[PDB]
Write a protein that binds this ligand. Structure first.
Ligand SMILES: CCCOP(=O)(O)OC[C@H]1O[C@@H](n2cnc3c(N)ncnc32)[C@H](O)[C@@H]1O
Length: 650
């Protein structure tokens, strides 16, 4: 075989995991929407792509969402000019579909499990309460003169009212622009200025992991260089003293107490913008309304096999696309219960995720490989003595998951009775692009497996620009046709949208990730194209080498980067984080490095061995958990963790 799975300890012949009994409709669990086998996935998926797929999409759109005006055209437009359109004559409102319609059916159903930073302050927020607060905030925004199409910035931490703020903007047709709470005054300022908002929603402070986010102080420093912001609405989350500018700043509770607890829904065109989401110049990714909402609704239902009484626990942050799509929009559109988790995986202790699961009897958990590796670094007794049997599906998103981490997840979070859904997608795709359907697909550790409904993906050889036909091929991932939830533009910079996604391989969407299709047709997403390392013609992916390294005992997490080398073209440089109890004095470091190199050669090949290996306490990571390999690549080529890496490279 040309294409290999990511390195694992389990032989490939013992590494295929069929959907387990909790996803077979046994033990009183819901029967899967799609099952029981690969063929049942294909039979349904084939209706969603190709020249006769309008029928399925029109039916799903009409069955999944409540519309004010029906659409007439299913899809139009394309990559070349970025004029993608779905359901364009239709009208609807995201707030109506995430709140009103469920409130009318069962107003006392829990919409949000609000898991506070302190476990004792947690509570359930009914659909009724969420909708009432959403309408109050909507009424407040309208009283500031916010109109359909205006941008509103949101600088909120992970408290449940973040959902009300998003949905209040959606209710009146304002375009929300959420900024991760804890970004600097400079970074907030850049995003506030770019979207030209006149209103900002924030908190006095946030609380995360027992620490204080000085959100209002950050805001005050940012707004000194934001001439357009006229109104700031401040949620009294801690009640500790914070500065308040007269006229500009008002308290959330005092404003909302003046307003009615209902507010009508603005009737939005399918293609009206729903939100801008900046990704780190900051790219303002724009999603419209109907296709984005339909895509989040469908992926949530089918990738996590959501059923009406489920309690879906996505542990991400609403500042991230993962929080947009699988905390707020996806789960609320489906009318189920969604978690807003305010803390960290290790606060107060690393048992927190599993205390949370057992407390609330969560049925699906969705988190990042960075969190999984973190909890793996902390040992098995924080999870061994938990029930966790309410879970059926375990999700991973954000980066390739090393099969070693996949097994830890499977063994201890799932007790070998959950399906593991490795979900590949991006801010720009709006919703999950490639993922196993848990009641149909037999999983391989580290493989996203098969494309979602509406996704028709190919592998292009970047050295020729041409599509590689068949299986057992590797290259760069591309999509052949638009899908309902694709980002529609980059805010006021459409040329950069076209140049970034539509120009590199004309006729296709370019994800920017390297990928492989193995002999069974399973997709393997192996890292960013920019992070590929070319050693003497051998194009190595980051996930390959990093998965090899973590197979060594004591390794907690690694990152590899390439650097210029006059003999091999490029050479591999590895940064390795060992588990904290590992005895660095008993094992001579020069011996560890040699055993690591030897391990990489066995699984991958002789060329793949690192030229150098740096031992570090941590890697530079974004708030979402992405490893900043571009930073490490530069330090090799000439917050506080980066200064330590530069020092260790000298
Ligand atoms: C979807 C939440 C994160 O969205 P962002 O826009 O922040 O980042 C998208 C990138 O994260 C990766 N990525 C995400 N998930 C996986 C994944 N499951 N497997 C492999 N790589 C992945 C891929 O590199 C992709 O280009």
């Amino acid at each position: 075989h040309h294409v290999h799975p990511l390195p694992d300890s389990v032989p490939e012949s013992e590494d295929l995991f069929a959907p387990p009994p909790r996803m077979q409709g046994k033990e009183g669990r819901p029967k899967p929407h799609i099952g029981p086998n690969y063929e049942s996935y294909v039979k349904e998926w084939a209706k969603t792509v190709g020249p006769n797929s309008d029928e399925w999409w029109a039916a799903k759109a009409r069955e999944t969402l409540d519309w004010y005006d029906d659409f007439k055209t299913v899809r139009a437009g394309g990559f070349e000019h970025g004029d993608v359109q779905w359901f364009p004559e239709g009208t609807l409102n995201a707030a109506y579909n995430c709140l009103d319609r469920h409130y009318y059916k069962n107003p006392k159903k829990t919409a949000i499990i609000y898991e506070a930073d302190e476990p004792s302050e947690s509570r359930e927020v009914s659909y009724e309460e969420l909708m009432q607060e959403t309408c109050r905030v909507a009424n407040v925004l309208k009283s500031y003169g916010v109109k359909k199409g205006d941008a509103v910035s949101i600088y909120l931490p992970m408290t449940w009212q973040a959902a009300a703020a998003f949905l209040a903007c959606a209710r009146i047709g304002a375009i929300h622009s959420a900024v991760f709470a804890g970004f600097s005054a400079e970074s907030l300022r850049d995003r506030v200025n770019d979207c030209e908002c006149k209103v900002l929603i924030t908190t006095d402070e946030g609380r995360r992991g027992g620490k204080t986010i000085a959100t209002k102080q950050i805001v005050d420093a940012a707004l000194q260089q934001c001439p357009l912001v006229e109104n700031v609405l401040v949620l009294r989350r801690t009640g500790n003293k914070v500065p308040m500018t007269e006229g500009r700043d008002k308290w959330w509770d005092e404003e909302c107490a003046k307003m009615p607890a209902y507010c009508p829904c603005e009737r939005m065109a399918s293609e009206d913008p729903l939100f801008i989401l900046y990704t780190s110049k900051p790219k303002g990714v724009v999603h419209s309304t109907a296709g984005y909402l339909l895509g989040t609704a469908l992926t949530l239902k089918y990738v996590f096999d959501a059923h009406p009484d489920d309690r879906f626990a996505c542990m991400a942050d609403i500042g991230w696309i993962t929080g947009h799509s699988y905390i707020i929009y996806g789960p609320l559109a489906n009318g189920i219960t969604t978690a807003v988790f305010e803390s960290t995986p290790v606060y107060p202790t690393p048992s927190r995720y599993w205390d949370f699961v057992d407390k609330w009897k969560a049925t699906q958990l969705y988190t990042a490989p960075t969190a999984i590796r973190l909890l793996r670094r902390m040992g098995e007794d924080h999870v061994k003595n938990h029930d966790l049997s309410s879970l059926r599906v375990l999700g991973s998103v954000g980066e390739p998951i090393n099969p070693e981490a996949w097994h830890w997840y499977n063994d201890f979070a799932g007790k070998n009775q959950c399906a593991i859904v490795d979900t590949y997608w991006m801010t720009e795709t709006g919703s999950i692009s490639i993922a196993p359907l848990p009641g149909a697909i037999s999983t391989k550790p580290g493989s996203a497996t098969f494309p979602f409904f509406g996704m028709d993906v190919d592998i292009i050889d970047p050295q020729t620009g041409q599509v590689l036909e068949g299986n057992d091929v590797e290259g760069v991932l591309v999509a052949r046709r638009p899908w309902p939830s694709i980002a529609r533009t980059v805010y006021r910079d459409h040329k950069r949208y076209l140049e970034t996604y539509m120009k590199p391989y004309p006729g296709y969407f370019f994800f920017g990730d390297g990928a492989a299709r193995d002999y069974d047709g399973y997709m393997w997403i192996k890292g960013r194209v920019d992070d590929v390392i070319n050693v003497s013609g051998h194009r190595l992916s980051t996930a390959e080498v990093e998965s090899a390294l973590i197979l060594h005992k004591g390794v907690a997490e690694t990152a590899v980067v390439g650097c210029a080398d006059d003999l091999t073209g490029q050479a591999v440089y590895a940064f390795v984080t060992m588990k904290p109890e590992f005895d660095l004095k008993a094992t001579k470091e020069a011996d560890l490095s040699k055993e690591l190199a030897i391990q990489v050669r066995k699984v991958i090949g002789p060329f793949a061995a690192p030229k150098k290996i740096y031992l570090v306490s941590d890697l530079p990571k974004t708030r979402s958990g992405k490893i900043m390999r571009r930073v490490l690549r530069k330090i090799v080529a000439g917050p506080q963790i980066v200064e330590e890496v530069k020092q260790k490279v000298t």
